[PDB]
Design a protein around this nucleic acid. Structure first.
Ligand code: NA
Ligand code: NA
Length: 327
DNA sequence: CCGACGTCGCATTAGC
DNA sequence: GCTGATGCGA
DNA sequence: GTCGG
């Protein structure tokens, strides 16, 4: 639906969501407002009243009241106020820095540190992740066009294969669903030598190679199974350099790989629909496994999974292309 | 009325 | 020194 | 904040 239809309302709800998460440290209210913003965003009618909106799942009495106020006045008093508030707006802003959550933001603003400049002045009070977040503040908020994602995938698949041709690497996220743009790159990695029942340098060797060819530029965190860092496409001659990008790489046991690929391919909406289907067939599906219930409700062991289709087939669904998994 | 609301790897840190 | 809790991000 | 046991 066009933004013009209820964009004022959904923008209002998103802003409220952010203040709950970043200022009030109320994560569940944050997700309440987001859920309401999503369902309203998909509503194919211009909302005429709070009562109309309340019919939608996730919109309750209080959001109905806010919509009435917005419709009758074009603003929300509480939002106008908190927007104007020096401390609250500063706390909310600082959390746009990767690594600065509500708690770090609150602590910075308590001691007078309110802007990117104040951060730039006080690097010794920032941890490693936060420094990297500050360094790439602008780049990290840019989207990644699919053409660059393809170029990024090219490098990743190539370098992974150069390390060991028996690795299996899959770039997931909305990119795998064919999205025209991405927020970051999510790479799922496995290897036949790594199972649930079985080196812990499988991940390190791949990260090391990607650093060696100067694709990976910085590290946010890194252990034996999850890497989170920064990358950059090489610059095309006398052209402007590419933005730095967020890349995650996780190593998953072979027997849990395709469950992982399914899960991180999404979308979130499609995943829950599929998780519902789902139990009904007497199966529990999470990021790692699919398991049978269970006349009482006792999960049996993980069923063997050798492809995404294998999962679909357990729950008697026909395989669905990543492009067809928006819901 | 009142609890659930996703879960967990890694980095940092609090307490012993 | 170690272990557990918390913050953070996805 | 919303839902539902
Ligand atoms: Na409702
Ligand atoms: Na942040």
């Amino acid at each position: 639906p066009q933004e013009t239809l209820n964009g004022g309302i959904t923008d209002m709800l998103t802003e409220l969501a952010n203040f709950e998460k970043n200022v009030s440290q109320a994560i569940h209210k944050y997700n309440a407002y987001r859920k309401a913003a999503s369902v309203i965003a998909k509503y194919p009618h211009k909302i005429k009243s709070g009562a109309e909106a309340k019919k939608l799942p996730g919109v309750g009495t209080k959001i109905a009241e806010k919509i009435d106020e917005f419709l009758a006045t074009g603003k929300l008093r509480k939002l106008e106020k908190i927007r104007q508030d020096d401390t609250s707006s500063s706390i909310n802003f600082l959390t746009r820095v990767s690594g600065i959550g509500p708690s770090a933001a609150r602590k910075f603003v308590d001691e007078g540190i309110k802007t990117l400049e104040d951060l730039r002045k006080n690097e010794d009070k920032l941890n490693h992740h936060q420094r990297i977040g500050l360094k790439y503040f602008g780049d990290f908020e840019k989207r990644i066009p699919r053409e660059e994602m393809l170029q990024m995938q090219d490098i990743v698949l190539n370098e992974v294969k150069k390390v060991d041709s028996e690795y299996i690497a899959t770039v997931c996220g909305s990119f795998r669903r064919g999205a025209e743009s991405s927020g970051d790159m999510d790479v799922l990695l496995t290897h036949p030598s790594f199972t649930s029942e079985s080196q812990p340098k499988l991940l390190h060797q791949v990260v090391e190679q990607l650093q060696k060819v100067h694709f990976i530029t910085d590290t946010l965190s890194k252990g034996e199974t999850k890497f989170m860092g920064v990358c950059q496409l090489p610059s095309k001659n006398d052209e402007k350099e590419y933005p730095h990008r967020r890349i995650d790489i996780r190593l998953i046991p072979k027997d849990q790989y395709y469950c992982g690929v399914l899960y991180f391919t999404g979308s979130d909406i499609f995943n829950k629909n599929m998780r519902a289907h789902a139990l009904e067939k007497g199966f529990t599906i999470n990021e790692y496994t699919i398991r049978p219930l269970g006349v009482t409700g006792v999960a049996g062991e993980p069923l063997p999974v050798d492809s995404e289709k294998d999962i679909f087939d357990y729950i008697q669904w026909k395989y669905r292309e990543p492009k067809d998994r928006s819901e």
